[PDB]
């Protein structure tokens, strides 16, 4: 059983995943070509969490009871 063909496929799969991100990063127009609202790191109204419109308490690190923990 020879697995050189398999190794090449695994290498391509890893490279293929980065292509999707690289293409999306190099295809989107720059913010200045858009409405020019600046970088996403400053647009806090956009990078904030989604809560269906109304902001609520921030409970990111609160405990979450689990009713199926025994299962």
């Amino acid at each position: 059983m020879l697995q050189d063909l398999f190794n090449n496929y695994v290498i391509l799969v890893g490279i293929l995943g980065l292509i999707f991100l690289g293409v999306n990063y190099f295809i989107v127009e720059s913010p200045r070509m858009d409405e020019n609202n600046g970088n996403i790191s400053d647009y806090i109204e956009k990078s904030g969490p989604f809560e269906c419109g109304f902001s609520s308490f921030e409970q990111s690190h609160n405990p979450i009871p689990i009713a199926f923990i025994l299962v």
Partner: protein, 353 residues
């Protein structure tokens, strides 16, 4: 040139084979999204996509390209790790699982006596990709999906693994290609019709497809773990989920419907008798037929994936937990005892040949 080109192609030939293999899977996955919308439309007495490319043949391209031209939303540009680690792990898990899927006799990238174990092990890694999105996230809907995702895994993983082991036990082999060839005289749908239903139910649960679509319930958790995803992270997760649908549909054709084996042996011989085995045209047609047999069986279950979505309401995940442990697990464990008893009784314990 000429001489230096006629060996350069030989040097790079097997990379073209893999690239063609990757394109073959992507085309099916790309047009499964179009097929699902078309199939549900007519069942719902609508049309489905027919205005993006001639009769809707470019619908998949437009959806992918538009999302690839979308802004990536993240707290900072350096946070590309957080929203990409999840989808990439999920995508790599399902793409690597396709290595052991033989389109014909020996026509798989990875051949091994442990192909069954590699298949199940690779799929389990994809679950870790989904839970990564809920990484102490500030989004409450993302968090709730991660809890549901873990609950679903506990449901199907035991049931799905044991059903595959029964088929492997019947053939006494963990090689997928050996399992396919063992169904020459009988397709395992007939002796193990209950297992095929159980396998399909577990396949629906594994892919988080309805009626087990609790992870991405639009009426419950807006978009689940993908509510905070956009542009490429959404595409990769969307691609991985549909790649699992094709993979599980192909697996159902392999385990219970003979894989690539012809529907009729007589028809297979007649078509191939029209071609000379001393020419490459015979093996081009042979690959089309054998994969065509697999495609027809796989397309039926991809149709069935869409069919159940358009015919059944969603089941609550806590009801799913009781469904697998109280019903599915006792049944599959009963069969894993029943089958060896039958084989030993009639002196038909399986061996590998």
């Amino acid at each position: 040139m000429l001489n230096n080109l006629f060996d350069f192609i030989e040097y790079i030939e097997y990379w073209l084979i893999i690239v063609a293999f990757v394109a073959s899977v992507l085309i099916v996955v790309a047009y499964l999204t179009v097929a699902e919308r078309k199939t549900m439309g007519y069942m719902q007495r609508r049309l489905g996509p027919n205005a993006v490319g001639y009769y809707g043949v470019l619908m998949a391209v437009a959806d992918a390209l538009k999302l690839l031209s979308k802004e990536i939303v993240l707290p900072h540009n350096g946070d590309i790790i957080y929203v990409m680690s999840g989808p990439l792990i999920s995508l790599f898990s399902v793409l690597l699982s396709w290595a052991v899927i033989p389109f014909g006799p020996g026509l798989s990238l990875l051949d091994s006596e442990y192909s069954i174990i590699y298949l199940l092990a690779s799929g389990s890694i994809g679950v870790f990709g989904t839970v990564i999105v809920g990484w102490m996230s500030n989004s409450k809907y993302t968090v709730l999906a991660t809890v549901r995702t873990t609950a679903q895994l506990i449901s199907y993983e035991l049931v799905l693994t044991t059903v595959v082991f029964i088929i492997a036990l019947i053939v006494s082999s963990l090689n997928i290609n050996v399992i396919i060839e063992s169904q020459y005289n009988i397709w395992y749908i007939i002796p193990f019709f209950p297992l095929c239903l159980i396998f399909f139910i577990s396949a629906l649960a594994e892919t988080a497809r309805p009626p087990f679509d609790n992870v991405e319930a639009e009426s419950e958790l807006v978009s689940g773990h993908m509510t905070e995803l956009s542009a490429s992270p959404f595409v990769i997760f969307f691609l991985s989920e549909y790649c699992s649908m094709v993979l599980m549909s192909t697996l159902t054709a392999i385990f219970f419907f003979g894989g690539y084996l012809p529907f009729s042996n007589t028809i297979h011989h007649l078509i191939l008798n029209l071609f000379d085995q001393h020419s490459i045209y015979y093996f081009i047609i042979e690959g089309i037929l054998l994969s065509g047999y697999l495609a027809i069986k796989a397309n039926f279950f991809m149709f069935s994936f869409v069919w159940i979505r358009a015919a059944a309401p969603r089941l609550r995940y806590d009801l799913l937990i009781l469904f697998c442990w109280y019903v599915l697990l006792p049944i599959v464990f009963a069969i894993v005892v029943f089958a060896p008893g039958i084989l030993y009784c009639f002196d038909a314990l399986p061996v590998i040949i």
